[model samples]
Target: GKHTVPYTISVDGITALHRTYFVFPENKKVLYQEIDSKVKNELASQRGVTTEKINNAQTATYTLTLNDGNKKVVNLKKNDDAKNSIDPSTIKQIQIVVK
Candidate 1:
């Protein structure tokens, strides 16, 4: 037996949520750690902030070798939400970081 699905399907009033995670450099302990408390507190107090958001905030680390045969490692840690949809930029201060 062969089954055929509908060629066209319609969806209405659909809301979508997207989340991603980044891993910052672990060697840059100071810089990475500094942003942790702030980011955590923000996600914690925020109404809709989720664990996925916090995990995505982690930074990625990379290593580079110089001509002098020296290796340098760096990491980037940041939290970014859709500019218009999440309104993360609207945060004015730490007080607003939450909620």
Candidate 2:
């Protein structure tokens, strides 16, 4: 099954930037790298901001919510290089925020 994953960046807690991604269960790492490399850079460039760019960021700061209302925090840096291979079919939505 395919999944819909939406990524968002909040600049200085005032603006919200967003992008959507589609992924299969087996190829979810594509989504991870997009956030780590792409989204991270975008967030770091915002003006009047407080968040810092993490080179190979290593923290479980992202918030993942499931269709059943379950929530989890995950480390994108590790997941991108390695693999978790979670079933994305159950993901209701994924919210990426940096503070």
Candidate 3:
């Protein structure tokens, strides 16, 4: 399951912003579902595919970049979808960007 953390952001001249962060385990099923939904929506909007066939050809891939300031790609698909997902210890923080 994914956890949601909420926080507030304040800018000097702009209004304060409220945001929520969704943190997912490395191999969580819902994470895949989310990525799938995102890809499907993007394709449907861009390629003019109707909602009916969006799920038929949906493919989602996840690349993880660690927080060490160095960019390393960790492919999430090859890992076990059930038990090999991310853990809280491995994730330092999640930032939700709101506009």
Candidate 4:
């Protein structure tokens, strides 16, 4: 069984973002898969995830911001693998380098 909604995904190692995660009915050709949502908010209103409702289907972009907010936008569709992974979300900006 599955229920579709808009919400957050938090894994021990941050979380993964999928195209299906952000699609809503207001937009045409929305996701066919189940989504998670909260607070009656259609968008993922968080520091790590932000949105812009560009009329062009391809312009609804979100960026994974860290060390603070984003000055750039992440164009999901531009990537052939629109499914790339990003850095973890933070309550506090923390970075680690492991060789």
lDDT of 2 by residue, 1-99 (tens): 455566555433545544655345543444445534444455555432223443333332466687789997655445543344455666666655544
Count of clashes, each model: 8, 0, 5, 7
Tell me the TM-score of each prediction against the true structure.
Answer: 0.22, 0.52, 0.28, 0.25
Q: Please, what are the lDDT tens digits per residue for candidate 4 over residues 1-99?
A: 222323343323354544333323332332211211121133334323322222224333333334465433443324332343332322122121111
lDDT of 2 at 91: 66
The all-Cα superposition gives candidate 4 an RMSD in Å to the true structure of 14.2
User: Over the stretch 1-99, how does candidate 1's per-residue lDDT look in tens digits?
Assistant: 221111111112222322322233323323323334434443444334454543454433223233345543333233231121212122122211211
Ranked by TM-score from best down, the candidates are 2, 3, 4, 1
Encode model 3's per-residue lDDT on 1-99: one tens digit a residue: 554323222112232433434455544344334533443344345444434543242322223333454322322223344333333334333321111
State residue 75's C-alpha deviation in candidate 3, in Å.
16
Question: Model 4: residues >4 Å from true position, as ranges?
Answer: 1-58, 68-72, 76-78, 90-99
Residue 84 lDDT (model 1): 15
The superposed Cα distance between candidate 1 and the true structure at residue 56, in angstroms, equals 6.8
The 10 consecutive residues of candidate 3 with the worst lDDT sum are: 5-14
